[PDB]
Curated annotation (Swiss-Prot):
This is Sirohydrochlorin cobaltochelatase. Co-sirohydrochlorin binds at residues 44, 83-84, 87-88, 91, 201-202, 206. The keyword Magnesium does not apply. The lineage of its organism: Bacteria, Pseudomonadati, Pseudomonadota, Gammaproteobacteria, Enterobacterales. It catalyses: Co-sirohydrochlorin + 2 H(+) = sirohydrochlorin + Co(2+); Co-precorrin-2 + 3 H(+) = precorrin-2 + Co(2+). In the absence of Co(2+), can act as a precorrin-2 ferrochelatase since, in conjunction with a uroporphyrinogen III methyltransferase such as CobA from P.denitrificans, it can complement an E.coli cysG deletion strain. However, this complementation is easily inhibited in the presence of low concentrations of exogenous cobalt, a result that can be explained on the basis of a higher specificity for cobalt over ferrous ions. Pathway: Cofactor biosynthesis; adenosylcobalamin biosynthesis; cob(II)yrinate a,c-diamide from sirohydrochlorin (anaerobic route): step 1/10. Cobalt chelatase responsible for the insertion of cobalt during anaerobic cobalamin biosynthesis. Can catalyze the insertion of Co(2+) into either sirohydrochlorin or precorrin-2. It is not clear which is the natural substrate in Salmonella. CDD domains: CbiK_C, CbiK_N. Pfam families: CbiK. The active site is at 144 (proton acceptor).
Length: 257
């Protein structure tokens, strides 16, 4: 009796959830034909909202594993759908370690950016969702998170793209790298237009409001005011099959360790 537990931050937006979370959940479940698929969200705020508005009861990672032990699952494999290997992920690391004694085997895969090779692979994956570019055009990715794990990861990715001349740049909403610096920089280089894409699992309010909207504080209005027309592409990273494949590869690395 084996289980597969897929852990996300969460979203209360059904459509982007279905397109990213569920799509990742499905591929992960499908690569484990002998496991039952279970879900857990981490964000209390999202859990409460789905409960009050939809009647949906989403377990936390602690509630999910306790219910799995009560159902007789002795071996549970867990994959978290995080981009950053940081604070959210370490919280799941602790909770898994705590509840380990309830099971014969508990295994946990790691977030997207957890080694040099993940950065390499993630940049290959991102290249698959980028539209055809004019040479004065670039794609601009919008990350989220101000922790030191998150912004260093965004900077590093920007550092690698720039060095290798990948036709994209990475910024982080209200974090680093800063989009105003990026805008200045792209303007001084002669950038003609940009494609804004979320560097996030799902397209939530950050992507809808801060990245793509018509509010004057959005990244696309600020690119436009700098004379660099911006076209928003509201899709989470879960919609990209190359990213879903990285999640799968991480689940199987953990199982194989």
């Amino acid at each position: 009796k084996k289980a597969l537990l897929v852990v996300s931050f969460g979203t209360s937006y059904h459509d982007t959830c279905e397109k990213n979370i569920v799509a990742c959940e499905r591929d992960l479940a499908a690569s484990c034909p002998d496991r039952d698929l279970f879900r857990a969200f981490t964000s209390g705020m999202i859990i409460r909202k789905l409960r009050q508005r939809d009647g949906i009861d989403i377990d936390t990672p602690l509630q999910a594993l306790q219910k799995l032990a009560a159902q007789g699952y002795q071996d549970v494999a867990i994959q978290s759908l995080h981009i950053i290997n940081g604070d959210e992920y370490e919280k799941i690391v602790r909770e898994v370690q705590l509840l380990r004694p309830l099971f014969t085997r508990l295994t946990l895969g790691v977030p997207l950016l957890s080694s040099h090779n993940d950065y390499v692979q993630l940049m290959q994956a991102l290249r698959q969702q980028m539209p055809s570019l004019r040479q004065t055009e670039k794609v601009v990715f919008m990350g989220h998170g101000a922790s030191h794990h998150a912004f260093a990861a965004y900077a590093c990715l920007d550092h690698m793209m720039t060095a290798q001349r990948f036709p994209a740049r990475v910024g982080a909403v209200e974090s680093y790298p800063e989009v105003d610096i990026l805008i200045d920089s792209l303007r001084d280089e002669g950038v003609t237009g940009v494609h804004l894409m979320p560097l996030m699992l799902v397209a939530g309010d950050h992507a809808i409001n801060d990245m793509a909207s018509d509010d004057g504080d959005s990244w696309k209005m600020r690119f436009n005011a700098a004379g660099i027309p911006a076209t928003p592409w509201l899709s989470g990273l879960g919609e990209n099959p190359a990213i879903r494949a990285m999640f799968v590869a991480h689940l199987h690395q953990a199982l194989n360790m």
